[PDB]
Amino acid sequence: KSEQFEYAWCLVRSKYNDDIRKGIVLLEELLPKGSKEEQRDYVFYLAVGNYRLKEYEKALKYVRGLLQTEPQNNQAKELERLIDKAMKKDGLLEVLFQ
Amino acid sequence: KSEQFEYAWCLVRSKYNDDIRKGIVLLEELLPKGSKEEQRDYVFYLAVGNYRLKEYEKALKYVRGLLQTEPQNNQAKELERLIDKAMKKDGLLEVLFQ
């Protein structure tokens, strides 16, 4: 189980979008199985994976879910601040042609 | 066993040089364990991993070892032709200051 995560961790790291989609799904499967601390890590990495796929909605959903339980996790705060920059630049680009 | 390779396959794919070094080592461990066909695949991927680490010597050692048994594997031939281009450009760059 602690190695089924390492696989998904490497997968959510990969340069190929398909390895990333596979990495999330393995993390979504490992999520109810997990412990308190394990779920906090899995959720963080699900936000990382969803962000690397421009799925910024779902990525913000996780990182805020974690930030409600851990308001002072600075790495979660930094990941939420990176999701906000991508979304506001993306929203600017969308409406550039009016 | 057929999943200990998938891990190392994803690892030898990664953007991080340390995940790659780990991926090779897992493939070097899986190499005697393997079957005929499995060893041919592992060796191919060891050449891929060693090439992505600029270890072009070791990468050529594998891809030629495979090419001796499989002279017509075109993917092994293409990987050996990519290792030759990297080495000849690298050798040109080394001696640019004379």
Residue numbers in the entry:
A (entry chain A), B (entry chain A): 32 to 129
Share the article's original sentences.
A tetratricopeptide repeat (TPR) motif containing mitochondrial outer membrane protein, mitochondrial fission protein 1 (Fis1), mediates mitochondrial fission by recruiting large cytosolic GTPase, Drp1, to the mitochondrial outer membrane. The cytosolic domain of Fis1 is composed of 6 tight α-helices with two anti-parallel TPR motifs forming a concave hydrophobic surface. Fis1 interaction with Drp1 occurs during cellular stress, but not under physiological conditions, suggesting that cellular signals during stress activate Fis1. Human Fis1 protein contains a single cysteine, Cys41, in the entire protein.
To explore this possibility further, we crystallized and determined the X-ray structures of the WT and three phosphorylation mimic-mutants of Fis1: Thr34Asp Fis1, Thr34Glu Fis1 and Tyr38Glu Fis1. Each of these mutants was previously shown to be sufficient to increase Drp1 recruitment to mitochondria and subsequent mitochondrial fission in cell-based studies. Consistently, we observed that the first 30 residues including the α1 helix were missing from the structure providing strong evidence that the α1 helix undergoes significant conformational change and is potentially disordered in the phosphorylated forms, whereas it was intact in the WT. We crystallized the phosphorylation-mimic mutants, Thr34Asp, Thr34Glu and Tyr38Glu Fis1, and we observed that in all the cases, these mutants crystallized as covalent dimers mediated by Cys41 disulfide bridge between two Fis1 protomers. As Thr34Asp, Thr34Glu and Tyr38Glu Fis1 have a greater propensity for a conformationally altered N-terminus and hence have more exposed Cys41, they crystallized as covalent dimers. Upon closer examination of the crystal structures, we observed that the concave hydrophobic surface in the covalent dimers of all the phosphorylation-mimic mutants was exposed. Our crystal structure not only shows the absence of α1 helix but also shows that there is no space for structured α1 helix in the covalent dimer as this space is occupied by α2 helix of another monomer. Here we showed that Cys41 is also oxidizable and mediates Fis1 covalent dimerization through disulfide linkage. This oxidation-induced Fis1 dimerization was obvious in the crystal structures of Thr34Asp, Thr34Glu and Tyr38Glu Fis1, where we saw a clear electron density for the disulfide linkage.
